[PDB]
Amino acid sequence: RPRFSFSIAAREGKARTGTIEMKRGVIRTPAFMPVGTAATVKALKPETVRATGADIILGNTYHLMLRPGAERIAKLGGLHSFMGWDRPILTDSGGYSEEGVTFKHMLSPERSIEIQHLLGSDIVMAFDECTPYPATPSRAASSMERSMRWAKRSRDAFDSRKEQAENAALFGIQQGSVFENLRQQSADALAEIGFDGYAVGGLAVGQGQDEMFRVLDFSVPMLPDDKPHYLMGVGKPDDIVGAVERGIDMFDCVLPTRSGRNGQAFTWDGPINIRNARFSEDLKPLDSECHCAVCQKWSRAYIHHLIRAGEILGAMLMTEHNIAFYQQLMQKIRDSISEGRFSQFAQDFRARYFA
Amino acid sequence: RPRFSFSIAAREGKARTGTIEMKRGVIRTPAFMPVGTAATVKALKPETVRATGADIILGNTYHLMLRPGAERIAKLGGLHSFMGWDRPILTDSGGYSEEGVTFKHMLSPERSIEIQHLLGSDIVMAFDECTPYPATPSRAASSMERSMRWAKRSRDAFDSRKEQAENAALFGIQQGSVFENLRQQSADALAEIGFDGYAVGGLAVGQGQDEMFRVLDFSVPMLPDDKPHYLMGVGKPDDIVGAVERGIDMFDCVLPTRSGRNGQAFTWDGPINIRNARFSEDLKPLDSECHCAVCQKWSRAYIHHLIRAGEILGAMLMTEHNIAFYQQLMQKIRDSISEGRFSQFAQDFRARYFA
Ligand SMILES: Nc1nc2[nH]cnc2c(=O)[nH]1
Ligand SMILES: Nc1nc2[nH]cnc2c(=O)[nH]1
Ligand SMILES: [Zn+2]
Ligand SMILES: [Zn+2]
């Protein structure tokens, strides 16, 4: 199988659908990656993550390097073996002095790539220094500047590890805050280095949806058309639909998992908090149309009771439903783009979801 | 199918193995009932409970009557439907004035049986007033005395509800503390009323194993030989082996579940706390011989990490392993009795387990 083969099967406006072929399997795009914080996707066995339709999951470099440690995970066979997920895994770089960052532990592009190496990540993220939003132009470009030099440093460390280069992929991360000119300069630096894919960094904090989207309107066309576009740490179902509309191919977010445990469930008619007393005797499944295991078996009232009682089965069922919903959302986006009816889909989606 | 048909397939000394046939399925005896506190067996889907080998689970009257309430559960279709377990369910009576108990809510034999009725329990427990250990003879028999009058009251309320009597079973509960004479008098009162099965109450608090066992040595032969014998709230794997040796057929306990979440795992070479740093790099499954899903897939080191990190997947895996172990223990006891080699089994078991 290939190391990293991105093919675009269909397009509609700025949106694309297609595949990323890797040694450990294929990734259908647009793709949602469940976040497996601490070598587990909160409350789900990997078999269940797969059942919901996920093709790839995300692991965090910072978290695992501290616990149980990178070299330990390496000695026990690598992250795939350790947690029981044999499909691709993308690791963030740990990022979210010119030499790197010291913390109360040391991180730099070189250490970051060797740690992700030790973890056995399939998709590696370049080490970066996130540009806190907001702002200042000659500040954001300073921050952006180091990032770009760090991307070069990550590229070189990765390529030196030929085991890594032959079997894994390296993604660069675009910074610039909300400055069109800082974003552009980052786009050029990154494409000048050359990466397997390009991420849009810095948009996952503060910025309402309108700001985020306006920044995507000019950022994403700056990226090489022929490589995957990954929007880091986004988002809500309507954020995803809007970002795909602006050319994004990959997503991660803690939303479905975290807000699941908190009692929030995502539905086609919008999110609901299952703790609300209105669900006390509701026999309907969480969502009238979800094909998930949970909605085939349990009612809102049962899940209402488990969550209010702080029962772990509750968190389990809510998280499985929410990841299933996100995956179902990605499948509908994929199908509608391939079929050339994604703009209709986005419209219909918003009407209902916001209704 | 029958309402309640107990058959004894084989015996060895005081021990028996056989079946209890009920409308919703068959119960293999000696039987371990996972405790499904709050309409869930902590951290497990019912399908997983079934996978481990459980034939019946236990629900608590006191807990569910307060949340989400008995009449509500009745309106939503009954406990089986509500929680997604279609096999038998035994409900405790809520027990653990002459008219009943008031609490900061009202409970009496009549209310207890109607609540278990509303829940749709398969096996109903008579309402009792547990004889706190220790003791005083003319006190324990006072407490025992009310219990016996309450058992009569439970018998009558149950039989008046003909929907209940035609489809469910009623168990009486033997009290007496550690007094051989109070136990005997309770045995006679109960058998004079007549129940489908007989429980040994009051032995699940304080009493070390030796005391518990000496009390079983004279209590259990007092019970009708031809009905099931249920030891309430027991216990550790070695407690179960010892009680079966003294004629017990049914068990419940929070041990496998609760101590699972706390990081304790049961093995054939004894319990272990997976949090211990000695498991940090242990690639072995939790138990070298367990046939459970968990031990087929994950290592001690992975589960070590999840539990120390407070990850829900950890509690899930540990609870599934522990319930699987208990069920595997019951199967080995059943097979060895049928095969007439249970005393050898008990011996071999103790050597290893305590080794
Ligand atoms: N490494 C990294 N991770 C993120 N997660 C969300 N935003 C970012 C970012 O800009 N960089
Ligand atoms: N109802 C009841 N439940 C118990 N659980 C443990 N012991 C007892 C008992 O004596 N009565
Ligand atoms: Zn669902
Ligand atoms: Zn096991």
Curated annotation (Swiss-Prot), chains A, B:
Q: What is this protein called?
A: Queuine tRNA-ribosyltransferase
Disulfide linkage: none
Cofactor note text? Binds 1 zinc ion per subunit.
Q: Which residues bind substrate?
A: 92-96, 128, 175, 202
Similarity section: Belongs to the queuine tRNA-ribosyltransferase family.
Q: What is its EC number?
A: 2.4.2.29
Going by the UniProt record, its keywords in alphabetical order are:
Glycosyltransferase, Metal-binding, Queuosine biosynthesis, Transferase, tRNA processing, Zinc
Function of this protein?
A: Catalyzes the base-exchange of a guanine (G) residue with the queuine precursor 7-aminomethyl-7-deazaguanine (PreQ1) at position 34 (anticodon wobble position) in tRNAs with GU(N) anticodons (tRNA-Asp, -Asn, -His and -Tyr). Catalysis occurs through a double-displacement mechanism. The nucleophile active site attacks the C1' of nucleotide 34 to detach the guanine base from the RNA, forming a covalent enzyme-RNA intermediate. The proton acceptor active site deprotonates the incoming PreQ1, allowing a nucleophilic attack on the C1' of the ribose to form the product.
Reaction(s) catalysed by this chain's protein: 7-aminomethyl-7-carbaguanine + guanosine(34) in tRNA = 7-aminomethyl-7-carbaguanosine(34) in tRNA + guanine
PANTHER family (UniProt xref): QUEUINE TRNA-RIBOSYLTRANSFERASE
Q: Which Gene3D superfamilies does the UniProt record give?
A: Queuine tRNA-ribosyltransferase-like (3.20.20.105)
List every stretch annotated RNA binding.
233-239, 257-261
Q: Cellular component terms, GO, for this chain's entry?
A: cytosol
A GO molecular function term, named singly, is:
metal ion binding
Q: Which domain of life does the UniProt lineage start with?
A: Bacteria
Cofactor(s), by name: Zn(2+)
Give the record's GO biological process terms. Answer: queuosine biosynthetic process; tRNA wobble guanine modification; tRNA-guanine transglycosylation
- Look up the record and name the pathway of this protein: tRNA modification; tRNA-queuosine biosynthesis
- Please tell me where Zn(2+) binds in this chain: 290, 292, 295, 321
Outcome when changing residue 128 to A: Abolishes catalytic activity
Assembly description: Homodimer. Within each dimer, one monomer is responsible for RNA recognition and catalysis, while the other monomer binds to the replacement base PreQ1.
Q: Which Pfam families match?
A: TGT (PF01702)
Q: Does the keyword Transferase apply?
A: yes
Active-site residues, as the UniProt record annotates them:
92, 252
Sections of the chain in a coiled coil: none
